[PDB]
């Protein structure tokens, strides 16, 4: 009477296709850094070394914008004492 | 596509309609109406020296 419900997400994988064409293994390319290397090298076994995988980039959090002075005159038009014909 | 079709011994799964290669070029196709697996070879080319 019990079941499990999960939600799909737009993620990239690396799927290992057998000789018979079936999928025997997979690697989630954002699970951990080791799987990022595995998806970068397109391999399931990585050799000893240092491998560049991605780009860290700090994202901006805020936005920040002379003393706003000179708005034009209407108060002398719309709130004027007297108009013309 | 364009190519030579030959009989092939590649075992597809019962939902896969065409094979592919590690260049992502289609080098096999299951035909419909008989579900045989057919290889695809490029039509033979080369220079003339």
């Amino acid at each position: 009477a019990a079941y499990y419900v999960g939600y799909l997400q737009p993620r990239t994988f690396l799927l290992k296709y057998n000789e018979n064409g079936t999928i025997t293994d997979a690697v989630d390319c954002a699970l951990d850094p080791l799987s990022e290397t595995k998806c970068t090298l397109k391999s399931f076994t990585v050799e000893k070394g240092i491998y560049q995988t991605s780009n860290f980039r700090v994202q901006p959090t805020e936005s920040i914008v002379p003393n706003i002075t000179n708005l034009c005159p209407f108060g002398e038009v719309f709130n004027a004492t007297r108009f013309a014909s | 596509g364009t190519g030579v079709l030959t009989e092939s011994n590649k075992k597809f799964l019962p939902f896969q309609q065409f094979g592919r290669d590690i260049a992502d070029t289609t080098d096999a196709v299951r035909d419909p109406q008989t579900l045989e697996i057919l290889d695809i070879t490029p039509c033979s080319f080369g220079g003339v020296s």
Partner: peptide, 24 residues
């Protein structure tokens, strides 16, 4: 309730035969 979903739920995405390959 929650449960870990270990490595489970991978499906064939495209109905393409591929033999002895690692497709991303």
């Amino acid at each position: 309730a929650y449960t870990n979903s270990f490595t489970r739920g991978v499906y064939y995405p495209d109905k393409v035969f591929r033999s002895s390959v690692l497709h991303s």
